Write a protein that binds this ligand. Structure first.
Ligand SMILES: [Ca+2]
Ligand SMILES: [Ca+2]
Length: 683
């Protein structure tokens, strides 16, 4: 098959996701609408159900709105059952689960969004039209709750396909966390404490780990093509890594979590998570910078480039980064006045690296600063808007030009207002020019490009004032004037191709599994795929896509390369994580581990999942506030199930590594449930 086929659920680099808040899009069926205080037929009470549903989404696919726009994927609200309680809101006089983030039963659907048959209708309709379906999923909590007053809301109660498990109050089984609420003081604090008043699920509890793992398979069984994990910054990395493996070994689908980063914010945990969790992240570094430059004027084009550059050094898999300019949590990008800024932001996002996600109603210039004003009902479905057409013209390039989907990015010209960059994947090239200044034109001289000598017209057809250009044999471009607010896109798509890997998914595997290598020039007759210098088993070989079975190599990260039947060797795609086996989440605890000021305790050990004795890649720094207090440290770690591990704890700083004394601690990871090991620091 092809890397662009709707069936390639492990690669979204050639796609454009359209984010829909189900309730605020289209009420395709009035018979399923809530009744009473839960519903607001006038669409004025922003926190009540307005009636949007899966049938309405289906309607926009069949009538050509979404398709006509060039959308290849849709990300919808969490489909699971939510609480029916209407909470008190002083401002909006009513607060409901219209958003779908207040889970009640993860094994059932929200009656107002539709039945499982309705959900299926949607999945089948999307696919029939070559559209992938992404679902929001929030395993961090259930719903708003007061353990002191079980009368408030539905007590954060959790059901298992109808049968109640328990609520926040009198939680004798310990399904939830009872450490009060987070004040975001630390990474650990925001994990084991509640997000505001939402009942915190305790996924270290065996029953909870199993429920969640079994609940996700329910949806995978429904045919979904991707998952959006909510608040991945508020759950342990160890559990999530273990949860990711559970998904990937069942039926691998592109997965990306939400790890909010503020303006100018960079978090080394965020980077580490994106690189080791087995899942991808939404680019908040991208999004925030983009808004600083095109929307709020708190930064220039030099900051847009530093982001492009730094972001490419920190992320092992930048082609997996989900980019956006706004969402259900941010103020709507269009703030009034000129719409050029949004239009330029959309073009820049659409031609840049990663996976473009577009918040619904952007193409319609919808405005709204703050939740919930930024979640108003779909205004209109007008296809004349410049925005709608920028997407129409740009979206398809992600399937037609490998450079745009997988290529690197390079700044070819720049000043405070102008950004000219190049996307390159072998001989395929894409060059983009953007002038953010709405009142000043620039004379572009000294511009060079990888585009072949020739005359190139604007892909946008002058939609954003772009024009054609002429390139010489030496790559030089004839001087041209970039008008105010101009965006021009020029490209070259090679006819021939040497073997080039532009993508590999999933990034976290195990021997015996199958991975998909995507690119160009692979050939039609099978060659060879290598994990290091070890050849794997070809499951299927095509010019743009190759599927292979992971050889039984020593667990760890491997660099992939491919050799054509003509002996042509490709480029390598590095850092694919081959695990020891099925993952299990174990909580490691160490007592009496006292440290001097600014010194932390980490976990190193026998397996790859533990860093194989490499103190530089040791697990930590471990936690020591919520669950257990210093000097006892603990950490939730993903480890190979049913394996006997030798490990030791250490105290690190920057210029001292103190190892535990005595002999390595031993433990045999449990086969099916979560586990806990407790030991005392050995002198
Ligand atoms: Ca409805
Ligand atoms: Ca949590």
């Amino acid at each position: 098959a092809s890397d662009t086929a709707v069936s390639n659920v492990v690669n979204y680099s050639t796609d454009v996701i359209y984010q829909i808040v189900t309730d605020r899009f289209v009420d395709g069926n009035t018979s399923n609408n809530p009744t009473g205080d839960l519903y607001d037929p006038t669409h004025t009470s922003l926190k009540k159900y307005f009636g949007g549903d899966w049938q309405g989404i289906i309607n926009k696919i069949n009538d050509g709105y979404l398709t006509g726009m060039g959308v290849t994927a849709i990300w919808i609200s969490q489909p699971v059952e939510n609480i029916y309680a209407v909470l008190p809101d002083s401002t909006f006089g009513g607060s409901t689960s219209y958003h779908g983030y207040w889970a009640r039963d993860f094994k059932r659907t929200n009656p107002y969004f539709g039945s499982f048959t309705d959900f299926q209708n949607l999945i089948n309709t999307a696919h029939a039209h070559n559209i992938k379906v992404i679902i929001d999923f929030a395993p961090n909590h259930t719903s708003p709750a007061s353990e002191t007053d079980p009368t408030y809301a539905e007590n954060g109660r959790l059901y298992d396909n109808g049968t109640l498990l328990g609520g926040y109050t009198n939680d004798t089984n310990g399904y939830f966390h009872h450490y009060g609420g987070t004040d975001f003081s630390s990474y650990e604090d925001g994990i084991y404490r509640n997000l505001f008043d939402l009942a915190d699920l305790n996924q270290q509890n065996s029953t909870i780990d199993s429920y969640l793992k079994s609940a996700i398979k329910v949806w995978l069984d429904m045919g979904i093509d991707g998952i959006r994990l909510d608040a991945v910054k508020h759950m342990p990395f160890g559990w999530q890594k273990n949860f990711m493996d559970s998904i990937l070994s069942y039926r691998p689908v592109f997965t990306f979590g939400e790890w909010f980063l503020g303006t100018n914010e960079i978090d080394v945990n965020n980077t580490y998570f994106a690189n080791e969790s087995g899942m991808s992240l939404l680019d908040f570094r991208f999004s925030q910078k983009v808004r600083q430059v095109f929307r709020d004027n708190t930064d220039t084009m030099y900051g847009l480039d530093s982001m492009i550059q730094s972001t490419a050094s920190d992320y092992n898999f930048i082609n997996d980064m989900v980019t956006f300019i706004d969402n259900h949590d941010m103020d709507r990008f269009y703030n009034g006045g000129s719409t050029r800024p949004v239009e330029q932001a959309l073009a820049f996002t659409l031609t840049s690296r990663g996976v473009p996600a577009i918040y619904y109603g952007t193409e319609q210039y919808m405005t709204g600063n703050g939740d919930p004003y930024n979640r108003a009902m779909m205004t209109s479905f007008n296809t004349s808007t410049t925005a709608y057409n920028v997407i129409k013209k740009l979206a398809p390039l992600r399937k037609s030009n490998p450079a745009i989907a997988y290529g690197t990015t390079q700044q070819r010209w720049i000043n405070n207002d102008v950004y000219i960059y190049e996307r390159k994947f072998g001989n395929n090239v894409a060059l983009v020019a953007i002038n953010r200044n709405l009142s000043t034109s620039y004379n572009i001289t000294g511009l060079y490009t990888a585009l072949p000598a020739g005359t190139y017209t604007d892909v946008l057809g002058g939609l954003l004032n772009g024009n054609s250009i002429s390139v010489a044999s030496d790559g030089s471009v004839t001087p041209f004037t970039l008008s105010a607010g101009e965006v021009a896109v020029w490209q070259y798509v090679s006819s021939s191709n040497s073997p080039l890997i532009g993508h590999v998914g999933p990034t976290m595997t195990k021997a015996g599994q199958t991975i998909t290598i995507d690119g160009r020039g692979f050939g039609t007759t099978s060659g060879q795929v290598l994990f290091g210098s070890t050849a794997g088993t070809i499951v299927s070989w095509d010019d743009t896509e190759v599927k292979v079975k992971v050889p039984s190599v020593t667990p760890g990260k491997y660099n992939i390369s491919l050799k054509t039947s003509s002996g042509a060797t490709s480029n390598t795609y590095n850092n694919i994580n081959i695990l020891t086996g099925n993952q299990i989440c174990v909580r490691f605890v160490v007592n009496n581990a006292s440290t001097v000021y600014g010194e932390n305790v980490y976990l190193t050990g026998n397996v790859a999942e533990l860093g194989n004795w490499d103190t530089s890649k040791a697990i930590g720094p471990m936690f020591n506030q919520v669950v257990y207090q210093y000097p006892t440290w603990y950490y939730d770690v993903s480890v190979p199930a049913g394996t006997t591990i030798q490990f030791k704890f250490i105290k690190k700083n920057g210029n001292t590594i103190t190892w535990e004394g005595g002999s390595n601690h031993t433990y045999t990871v449990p086969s099916s449930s979560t586990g806990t090991v407790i030991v005392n620091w050995q002198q």
